[PDB]
């Protein structure tokens, strides 16, 4: 049960989109969307794959961001000779999971590229 | 003062090797090569021109990176803790090749930028002791 321009599954609604944005906005895009609105989240296999073959089947082949952002910004970096981090050279600030309408496994980006999406909450 | 074939800065010995490991590989092959010896780390600019340096006189390639001593520990494939809409994460789908969690610097950067790199993919190192 969801609006016209949303498609069901399991109790969720899920929409794609095809403006490109990079992860941040993508997000806060969804928020105003619908109450409750997010970047899709996947905890299932069945619900990835139904999510795939809607944003393919929708915009074909591209890009879609998920709702993880900053996947190893928290994790305990250091270096094999217990030198202190300090100084800091890094390509890229911040990494985030997109995957392709092609098939549902879980790939990383810059949080900073642009991509399609798609949004999602509870019905 | 170091090792014959190895170069000095700051009181410390560095060394390119153009054979490729793995990073785990390289880690403890630079254990065993000097005493001391560990993937490099750079700690200052200085150091980092220095060792940017020291790599581009033997890998002239940008087909592949060259390895650095820092990494993250954790065995997890990420570590942030919840999806954008709040919940936990119950369930992974990851291409392994797809979690990066060691590092390298690029000939297109001048060996400085660090980068994101698969650790089991097999690359030149240096190691520093
Ligand atoms: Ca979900
Ligand atoms: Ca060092």
């Given at each position: 049960?969801?609006?016209?321009?949303?498609?069901?599954?399991?109790?969720?609604?899920?929409?794609?989109?095809?403006?490109?944005?990079?992860?941040?906005?993508?997000?806060?895009?969804?928020?105003?969307?619908?109450?409750?609105?997010?970047?899709?989240?996947?905890?299932?296999?069945?619900?990835?794959?139904?999510?795939?073959?809607?944003?393919?089947?929708?915009?074909?082949?591209?890009?879609?961001?998920?709702?993880?952002?900053?996947?190893?910004?928290?994790?305990?970096?250091?270096?094999?000779?217990?030198?202190?981090?300090?100084?800091?050279?890094?390509?890229?600030?911040?990494?985030?999971?997109?995957?392709?309408?092609?098939?549902?496994?879980?790939?990383?980006?810059?949080?900073?590229?642009?991509?399609?999406?798609?949004?999602?909450?509870?019905? | 003062?170091?090792?014959?074939?190895?170069?000095?800065?700051?009181?410390?010995?560095?060394?390119?090797?153009?054979?490729?490991?793995?990073?785990?590989?390289?880690?403890?092959?630079?254990?065993?090569?000097?005493?001391?010896?560990?993937?490099?780390?750079?700690?200052?600019?200085?150091?980092?021109?220095?060792?940017?340096?020291?790599?581009?006189?033997?890998?002239?390639?940008?087909?592949?990176?060259?390895?650095?001593?820092?990494?993250?520990?954790?065995?997890?494939?990420?570590?942030?803790?919840?999806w954008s809409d709040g919940s936990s994460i119950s369930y992974e789908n990851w291409?392994?090749?797809?979690?990066?969690?060691?590092?390298?610097?690029?000939?297109?950067?001048?060996?400085?930028?660090?980068?994101?790199?698969?650790?089991?993919?097999?690359?030149?190192?240096?190691?520093?002791?």
């Amino acid at each position: 049960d969801c609006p016209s321009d949303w498609s069901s599954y399991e109790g969720h609604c899920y929409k794609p989109f095809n403006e490109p944005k990079n992860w941040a906005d993508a997000e806060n895009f969804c928020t105003q969307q619908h109450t409750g609105s997010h970047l899709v989240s996947f905890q299932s296999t069945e619900e990835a794959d139904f999510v795939v073959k809607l944003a393919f089947q929708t915009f074909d082949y591209g890009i879609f961001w998920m709702g993880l952002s900053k996947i190893w910004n928290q994790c305990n970096w250091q270096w094999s000779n217990a030198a202190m981090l300090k100084y800091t050279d890094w390509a890229e600030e911040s990494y985030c999971v997109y995957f392709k309408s092609t098939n549902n496994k879980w790939r990383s980006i810059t949080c900073r590229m642009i991509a399609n999406f798609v949004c999602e909450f509870q019905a | 003062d170091c090792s014959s074939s190895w170069s000095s800065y700051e009181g410390h010995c560095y060394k390119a090797f153009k054979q490729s490991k793995t990073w785990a590989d390289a880690e403890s092959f630079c254990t065993k090569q000097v005493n001391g010896g560990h993937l490099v780390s750079i700690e200052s600019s200085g150091e980092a021109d220095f060792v940017a340096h020291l790599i581009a006189q033997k890998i002239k390639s940008a087909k592949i990176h060259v390895w650095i001593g820092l990494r993250a520990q954790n065995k997890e494939k990420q570590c942030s803790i919840e999806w954008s809409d709040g919940s936990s994460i119950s369930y992974e789908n990851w291409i392994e090749e797809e979690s990066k969690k060691c590092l390298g610097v690029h000939k297109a950067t001048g060996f400085r930028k660090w980068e994101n790199f698969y650790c089991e993919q097999r690359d030149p190192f240096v190691c520093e002791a």
